[PDB]
Design a binder for this molecule. Structure first.
Ligand SMILES: *[C@@H]1O[C@H](CO)[C@@H](O[C@@H]2O[C@H](CO)[C@@H](O[C@@H]3O[C@H](CO)[C@@H](O)[C@H](O)[C@@H]3O)[C@H](O)[C@H]2NC(C)=O)[C@H](O)[C@H]1NC(C)=O
Ligand SMILES: *[C@@H]1O[C@H](CO)[C@@H](O[C@@H]2O[C@H](CO)[C@@H](O)[C@H](O)[C@H]2NC(C)=O)[C@H](O)[C@H]1NC(C)=O
Ligand SMILES: *[C@@H]1O[C@H](CO)[C@@H](O)[C@H](O)[C@H]1NC(C)=O
Lengths: 208, 183
């Protein structure tokens, strides 16, 4: 009956373009207990307050977690034209959302660090024209098409990736480019909470 | 702004030849030079732009090459500043019959350099290669909204074409059975 937060606290967090998603239904959470394990640097919310989201009932609660540097805070808005919201990760507006940038402390030894932070700064498709480019903007709550070609961690800032397509996939090429950010002393992560309301299925409630 | 290019010859084969220096030098020096012969690994190239006024805060901002050129190896053959905040990049496919000009404007936030797709400009050749030794460089107007450059026409004669940034076609301002050497 307790919401399983375990996969977030163990292993290496994926990059922003490969965010892992925990879907919580029919359970009971203590969110403040989870955020107490970290060092919360920024906690903003939309269509809901942070104080409420740790204390209300929903039919379903989704928690996306990934590796994210605190220097690119300005880029994790959804009213932004940055590469993060363009090609990597984007939250939906039709339901309350919350965004949390946290830092793994010394007391949390069960989360491993990767070599560096990595994000996509270009993910477009070249048409059978071989002249026409159609930038592949990611949709809300979805993965970019270029996750098929961009590896789990960009080896070097500037690496470009390509994949020729069959006529049944639209022909032409799928094309992407990588970029990196230096790793910090302690791991810097981001969390995206997104709640939904079913009719009789108000099942995810904080415990007492 | 300072735009600079980053070359990477890490995996490019190096030619070696001996240098038999002065009669006092007893052991000749071997000289290593990254030299991509026909078919070898070419050096990669990236283009970065830096804000010289306030640098200690910000980083270099990479300007990625268009997708039309990212289908393989490619060259960077011209960098021209149109205005104080606009930059033009000529890219060139490794198979040198496909070049493209990229017009990139500066944005107050990220992305620092916004390159609209509608102001890309392609240059191809079905007979041979593009240009004489490299495609002509764009000669921008004062306002950076149009540039004259040298192109081949239907009869295959290098003449001056009038390019509009946002419009896809160009207009020849000369013609004849003769060529233009340079603007
Ligand atoms: C400059 O160019 C060199 C030569 O390509 C770059 O180093 C090389 O990077 C490639 C990745 O593009 C490495 O190849 C292999 O990639 C696979 C992918 O999974 C991986 O499993 C292999 O272990 C390996 O990483 C290659 O090893 C590497 N060579 C080196 C480091 O000597 C270099 O990153 C480029 N630098 C810049 C600034 O562009
Ligand atoms: C640029 O050159 C390449 C090769 O020189 C051209 O690709 C060839 O195109 C012809 C006719 O379209 C084909 O018969 C060949 O099979 C192609 N080569 C390969 C390796 O497949 C390409 O068409 C040229 N680009 C332009 C715009 O003309
Ligand atoms: C939730 O966790 C906080 C952490 O400080 C604790 O104070 C509180 O008693 C917990 N409540 C429940 C119902 O588990």
């Amino acid at each position: 009956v307790e919401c399983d937060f375990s996969p977030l606290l163990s292993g290496t967090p994926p990059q922003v373009y490969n965010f892992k998603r925990l879907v919580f239904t029919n359970c009971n959470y203590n969110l403040t207990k989870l955020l107490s394990l970290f060092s919360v640097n920024d906690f903003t919310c939309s269509q809901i307050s942070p104080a409420a989201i740790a204390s209300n009932c929903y039919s379903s609660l989704i928690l996306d977690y990934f590796s994210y540097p605190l220097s690119m805070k300005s880029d994790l808005s959804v009213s932004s034209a940055g590469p993060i919201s363009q090609f990597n990760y984007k939250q939906s507006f039709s339901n309350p959302t919350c965004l949390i940038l946290a830092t793994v402390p010394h007391n949390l030894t069960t989360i491993t660090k990767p070599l560096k932070y990595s994000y996509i700064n270009k993910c477009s498709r070249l048409l059978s024209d071989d002249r026409t480019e159609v930038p592949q903007l990611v949709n809300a709550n979805q993965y970019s098409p270029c996750v098929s070609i961009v590896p789990s961690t960009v080896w070097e800032d500037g690496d470009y990736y390509r994949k020729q397509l069959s006529p049944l996939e639209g022909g032409g090429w799928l094309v992407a480019s990588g970029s990196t950010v230096a790793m910090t002393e302690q791991l810097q992560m981001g969390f995206g909470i997104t709640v939904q309301y079913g009719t009789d299925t108000n099942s995810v409630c904080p415990k007492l | 702004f300072l735009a600079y290019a980053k070359f990477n010859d890490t995996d490019v084969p190096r030619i070696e030849y001996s240098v038999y220096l002065d009669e006092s030098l007893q052991y000749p020096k071997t000289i290593h030079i990254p030299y991509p012969k026909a078919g070898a690994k070419n050096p990669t190239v990236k283009l970065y732009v830096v804000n010289t006024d306030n640098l200690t805060d910000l980083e270099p901002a990479q300007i990625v090459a268009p997708a039309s050129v990212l289908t393989g190896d490619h060259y960077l053959c011209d960098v021209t500043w149109a205005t104080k905040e606009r930059i033009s990049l000529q890219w060139l496919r490794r198979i040198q019959n496909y070049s493209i000009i990229d017009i990139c404007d500066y944005n107050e936030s990220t992305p620092k350099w916004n390159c609209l797709v509608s102001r890309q400009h392609i240059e191809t050749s079905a007979t041979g290669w593009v240009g004489r030794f490299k495609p002509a460089e764009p000669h921008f107007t004062s306002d950076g909204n149009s540039f004259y450059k040298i192109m081949s026409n239907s009869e295959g004669y290098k003449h001056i074409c009038l390019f509009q940034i946002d419009k896809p076609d160009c207009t020849f301002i000369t013609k004849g059975a003769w060529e233009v050497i340079g603007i």
